[PDB]
Amino acid sequence: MTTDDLAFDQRHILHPYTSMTSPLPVYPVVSAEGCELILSDGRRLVDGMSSWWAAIHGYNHPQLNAAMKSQIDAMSHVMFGGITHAPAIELCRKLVAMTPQPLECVFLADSGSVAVEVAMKMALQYWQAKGEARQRFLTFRNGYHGDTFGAMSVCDPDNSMHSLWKGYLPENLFAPAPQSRMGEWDERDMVGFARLMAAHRHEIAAVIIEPIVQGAGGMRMYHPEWLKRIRKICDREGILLIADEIATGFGRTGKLFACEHAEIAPDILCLGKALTGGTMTLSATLTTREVAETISNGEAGCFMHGPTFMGNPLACAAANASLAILESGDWQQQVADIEVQLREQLAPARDAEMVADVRVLGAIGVVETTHPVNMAALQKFFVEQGVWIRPFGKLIYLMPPYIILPQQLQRLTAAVNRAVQDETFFC
Amino acid sequence: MTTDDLAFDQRHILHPYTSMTSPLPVYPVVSAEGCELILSDGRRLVDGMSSWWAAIHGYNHPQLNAAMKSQIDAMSHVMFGGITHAPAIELCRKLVAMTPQPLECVFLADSGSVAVEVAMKMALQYWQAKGEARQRFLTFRNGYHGDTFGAMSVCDPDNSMHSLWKGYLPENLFAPAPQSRMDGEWDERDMVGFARLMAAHRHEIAAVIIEPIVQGAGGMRMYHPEWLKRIRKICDREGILLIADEIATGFGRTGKLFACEHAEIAPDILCLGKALTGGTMTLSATLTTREVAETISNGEAGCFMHGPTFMGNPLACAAANASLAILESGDWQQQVADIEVQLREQLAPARDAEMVADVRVLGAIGVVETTHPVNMAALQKFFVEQGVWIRPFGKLIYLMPPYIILPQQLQRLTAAVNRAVQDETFFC
Ligand SMILES: Cc1ncc(COP(=O)(O)O)c(CNC2C=CC(CC[C@H](N)C(=O)O)C=C2)c1O
Ligand SMILES: Cc1ncc(COP(=O)(O)O)c(CNC2C=CC(CC[C@H](N)C(=O)O)C=C2)c1O
Ligand code: NA
């Protein structure tokens, strides 16, 4: 990649949530292997982010590559209307088997935001079919579910800046962010949620939350009793529960799915990211036959959704390989060992002036700071330490591949500890 | 593939816009090559659908395959936040160069619906940043732009059953479907409805959004290019942004590289997908002008607020680059022109069948519209029995084949269509 290439990127290529006028530095990556990203000039970086949490098996994984190349040899893609294929069937068999028993119907889609849109549409169509006037969603503050208009409508109105779309987005119900930590349970915490449930129980189509961990909305880790109470409340009121596990699914929090921490099953489950081992985009939204059949028996005769590339053979094959790796079960001790090391190596950050909080769960390690990070300056510092860490807001956090070596994880935590010693990289 | 596999699929796997309680049969596909799909039982079918518009180079294309395998060797994926890579840069260079001069800023995304959502958010943020009170979209009836919630808000309310979401979906403005045909003459009267809505709401409209020339899902309609010339001029006069959704028409399908070329106009925002990757896997792109891209970033947000996990996916970009490289040979132009002539010639006799309401053709799109709806299970079986994959929808029996299709293969497709409509058997 020439300098002109980089110039073109800066002036012509929009990057995720960043200015086209005040771009901060980008780093040119040529390849990746194991837990390392390789830059154009040869610099090798230990990946602390798993490419936004998806690459749980690292990069250039033999199993993943083999499955992908083999599916390309058969067919990378064929349409899913009136046709089915082995990769979709094998993938759906695994998804049904690995999730709670009631979740036995699968709607594959292209991305996390779309999987959330699908779950939302499922709930609305469900009630439309039952002839129940229910169109509200009840969610938590600090929640984040994606970037498309439906998903945006259930994101924290303050973090996702709902003022920008005030008038276009439907108005949903936002209970207080869960206060009890993953910590002791305080009954005082339920008051806000209960309040909204009592006043709006007749019109709520579904409750939607990220289980245990609220990711992009603040890397918050809350008490599982919340999920227990919400499942019970939904059960009593006849409301659907949507669990967004696009970030928490496939082992990240120490359990296969975060709902397991509370031993609850949602009515609708959204999955993505690590689904494909972070090789390419794919999502899945699972629900019950009660939901799936009711919808088909309604006025529309079917669930009204179906994107062009639905069921893409290549992506399904990658996902099959990713799930196959998890089948060994090795992730359980890998994540447990990571958790221990994170909790050990991040503890010193609690002596640093710039730190507000340190919290760890499975392969998620968070250092919350008192002031906003300088994302450009901190990223450069990290690159200089030979690590890839992408902080944002007041969070310097790690979500590494499950296969990361102790010495690699150590470089990440050391860099973090060093970074927070200095106002240098803040405001 | 076993029959148990088919049972699992029927009972546990949702398919696009189809019932779970009253299933229709699906056909198991094990592989595909050239312009053929290969069923699990060994039957080979000539593909008449291009897997919904996208597989313009067919299947198991050596150039696409090699490009995908090579990218896997480097990295199938890496995040795009604070990172860039060669496949993304090359693709964006190509996209900027092949589209109208003003369109030079590229937002890569995952799917067509997301690309439309991005276009719509761009329009909203553009006006929110100039301090103007514009949150409505003006679109045409019989339009389809995706099935995520924002996209649904600009789809035809009847065709997409907006009654199901009545009260949840924002109410946009719907001008009548364009009446003048690509085949025929322009009629000034066509404009009254659109002109009327514009005059009454010119002040609240953030953008006009349409599919140029061909409205796909909403009826496979083919309208007169004068429509786009007018819409461009009107948008220009009123200071309104024009969004062209070319997710279906892009990359040669209508006989021109982009359907906007039939009118020689450029939109402010252009959405692409489908054939972008040669139908190998999902990827989309929304391009806009410097004026739009810079204005948004200077707004309160400080940036365009969107960024999906797999944005810029190296693997998909590599496939898209290979697909575009194939189109650089220019061979598609004659290929599509020849397909067009053959479709016109061989579907023409369908116009004398009693079951046929209309026959219309543009580039590598051939449509036989019928008077009654098709019997899906029955007609699908007939087609497969003829050794062809044609998937009709409602009153439309259509062909959109890969550009590489051989005349003999194309002839089997048209023969089958003509045979399907000769009597009332496969209808209702
Ligand atoms: C829990 C959850 N649900 C849905 C989605 C949307 O999935 P997509 O595939 O459509 O993106 C996500 C997406 N996860 C994200 C993770 C990180 C960021 C950005 C963090 C920070 N602001 C930064 O700039 O780096 C955004 C989305 C999800 O987690
Ligand atoms: C013009 C246009 N714009 C947007 C989209 C959305 O792209 P996705 O990748 O998100 O799907 C598309 C393509 N989407 C569809 C087009 C038509 C249908 C209906 C098919 C019909 N039911 C049938 O069986 O034949 C569905 C999605 C597009 O063309
Ligand atoms: Na299950």
Ligand code: NA
């Ligand atoms: Na251009």
